[PDB]
Design a protein around this ligand. Structure first.
Ligand SMILES: O=P(O)(O)C(O)(Cc1cccnc1)P(=O)(O)O
Ligand SMILES: O=P(O)(O)C(O)(Cc1cccnc1)P(=O)(O)O
Ligand SMILES: C=C(C)CCOP(=O)(O)OP(=O)(O)O
Ligand SMILES: C=C(C)CCOP(=O)(O)OP(=O)(O)O
Ligand SMILES: [Mg+2]
Ligand SMILES: [Mg+2]
Ligand SMILES: [Mg+2]
Ligand SMILES: [Mg+2]
Ligand SMILES: [Mg+2]
Ligand SMILES: [Mg+2]
Lengths: 344, 344
């Protein structure tokens, strides 16, 4: 797996080179292009590259090796990097809105001295780079428009998910009544499940020439369920994770977020425990945040998570057995293995 | 002209209706859709609608009236509203980054209590709505991909212009040496000239089936020059404009912006006057901002602007005479008339 990763990261230098080549033809925007490189180098590198690697691995498993030529394989890891750019755009913006401190083992881009809210445009430039690369490498391809629409839809989906997340998590207002299982499943479906799990497999499918409605609908049933689990896992790691491993500091309690943990807490809270949560949740005070963590540990939520993860993996495996065909089960199995029991 | 405007604004209620119809099929995202309507109602309404109206007026002048059917005309004002959505996205984001107080006669969306930096996602949703409308009304059209790429390119262009603007205007740092005419022309070309003047005429050209490289290149020569003047006019109105008319408070001096006014000031400043500008520019202090305004008025920059506007209009008119053909000169003349001597 570490060999798959290294080949993918080795292509980033050319991705930057092609995206910052504009300085030759237009020396006037030289500084802007130099800032884009700085934004690319900081915000697209450091992660696990699960989405980008999924595009590359799913492409090799869906396309016949006699068809996988040098150009065809370059297009596959360029689209992989396009998904990594979509990730970069989403995270730079989300770290501002969530008032987060760290990302991928370093300070958040907006928290850097000399950046600040300029990071909003930087996030937008990262998004702009997807369509630049799609045009430079896939314009003459039959799946060109299908990939453009798939990335556009992925953006709208996450942004609607982001609207739901932000409306359920108001700063200064107690929203315990909206923290339900039905609300949670609606948020994470749009917010994470589509771009993190459906988008990479669907992009590799369109590139393989699998554009069928039924085929895409079947992959979606598995992948949207995989995405729900991945977000539940991220919600657990925000509180019970190790920041040296995760590369980020948790803010869900301070930010009044509709975390899977608070949904589970409210399902098992006594009237007394509900007031402890009402009085201490969604506030900046360290002592208040510590009080909520103590209640989660008291309701044995880390073990509730361990049981969920076991039942969830068995459900996703049952979904692979039901809907994988005619695609190789390894397509969905490889991604499932890379996220199950994850600590990063 | 006021009759052209009223018909265009009357179509906004249907634009909202089609974009917020998702609540029927998906009641789970109801609140998110309700927030999108609130974002659309606040941020896409209030302006002069020059870009949206340009798409509609240029379409009727380029397409034969026997071909202008009910569906064909609906597609024209939908693409007009798509340009107004691109404007909304840019302004919501720019008002955060510029730390502006008002927009279109009301408080900035991000300055609204309960909104704040959530406005970043709201800006992104406005951008998402362009491609939603392009898909719902122009997917079966021969110019579909051409319009998608034209809006994508318009975004990258403005965002690169925005990178240049923000890098030349650092908070806390004296950047008088970079405030040159060559730097100014580079910023506003990418930042404003492409999306505000080229994008509306080019979209109406593609819809009329005029996709020729030479035809688009010729319109670009006129329109990019028109855009340079429009930004110069906006830079003048930031200081010498009336906020009841403009609907916005100026921040260029406080924000250390490479304004056309500071470029002209530095070209006419004595060594003594240069130090007055160096000591008082780019700071929040009201007295410091007032000192810079006094120097501009002392160098007679409002009259320097009046002479520029006269020479600029004659240059753009000469460009219409050179490059309008085979397009009707009214296409470029109508837009020129709507921005020349502007106070809004
Ligand atoms: O990495 P983070 O900040 O923990 C997160 O997962 C980031 C994110 C951004 C956009 C879409 N989905 C997740 P969040 O939702 O704020 O918990
Ligand atoms: O409306 P504003 O804020 O005066 C402006 O024109 C807004 C704007 C946003 C995006 C592109 N071009 C202009 P700016 O450049 O900040 O002076
Ligand atoms: C969808 C959510 C959970 C955001 C972060 O995802 P990752 O955990 O995949 O972050 P990176 O690997 O890209 O750094
Ligand atoms: C390109 C710049 C100068 C931003 C504002 O343009 P407008 O003056 O056209 O603003 P609205 O009419 O859309 O409100
Ligand atoms: Mg976050
Ligand atoms: Mg978030
Ligand atoms: Mg999280
Ligand atoms: Mg501004
Ligand atoms: Mg600005
Ligand atoms: Mg201005």
């Amino acid at each position: 797996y570490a060999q798959e990763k290294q080949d993918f990261v080795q292509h980033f230098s050319q991705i930057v080179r092609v995206l910052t080549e504009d300085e030759m033809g237009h020396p006037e925007i030289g500084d802007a292009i130099a800032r884009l490189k700085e934004v690319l180098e900081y915000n697209a590198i450091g992660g696990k590259y699960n989405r980008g690697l999924t595009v590359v691995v799913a492409f090799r498993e869906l396309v016949e090796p006699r068809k996988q030529d040098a150009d065809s394989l370059q297009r596959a890891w360029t689209v992989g990097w396009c998904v990594e750019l979509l990730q970069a755009f989403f995270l730079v913006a989300d770290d501002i809105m969530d008032s987060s401190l760290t990302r991928r083992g370093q300070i958040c881009w907006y928290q850097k001295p000399g950046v600040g809210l300029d990071a909003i445009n930087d996030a937008n430039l990262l998004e702009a780079c997807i369509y630049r690369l799609l045009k430079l490498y896939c314009r003459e391809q039959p799946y060109y428009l299908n990939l453009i629409e798939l990335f556009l839809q992925s953006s709208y989906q996450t942004e609607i998910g982001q609207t739901l997340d932000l409306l359920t998590a108001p700063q200064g207002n107690v929203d315990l009544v909206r923290f339900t299982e039905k609300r949670y499943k609606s948020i994470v479906k749009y917010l994470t499940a589509f771009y993190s799990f459906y988008l990479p497999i669907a992009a590799a499918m369109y590139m393989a020439g699998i554009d069928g409605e039924k085929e895409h609908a079947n992959a979606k049933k598995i992948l949207l369920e995989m995405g729900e689990f991945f977000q539940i896992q991220d919600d657990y790691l925000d509180l019970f994770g190790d920041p040296s491993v995760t590369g980020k500091i948790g803010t869900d309690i301070q930010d009044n977020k509709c975390s899977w943990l608070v949904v589970q807490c409210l399902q098992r809270a006594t009237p007394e425990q509900y007031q402890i949560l009402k009085e201490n949740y969604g506030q900046k005070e360290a002592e208040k945040v510590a009080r909520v963590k103590a209640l989660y540990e008291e309701l044995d939520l880390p073990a509730v998570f361990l049981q969920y993860e076991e039942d969830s993996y068995s459900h996703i495996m049952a979904l692979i057995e039901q809907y994988a065909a005619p695609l190789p089960p390894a397509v969905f199995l490889g991604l499932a293995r890379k996220i199950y029991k994850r600590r990063k």
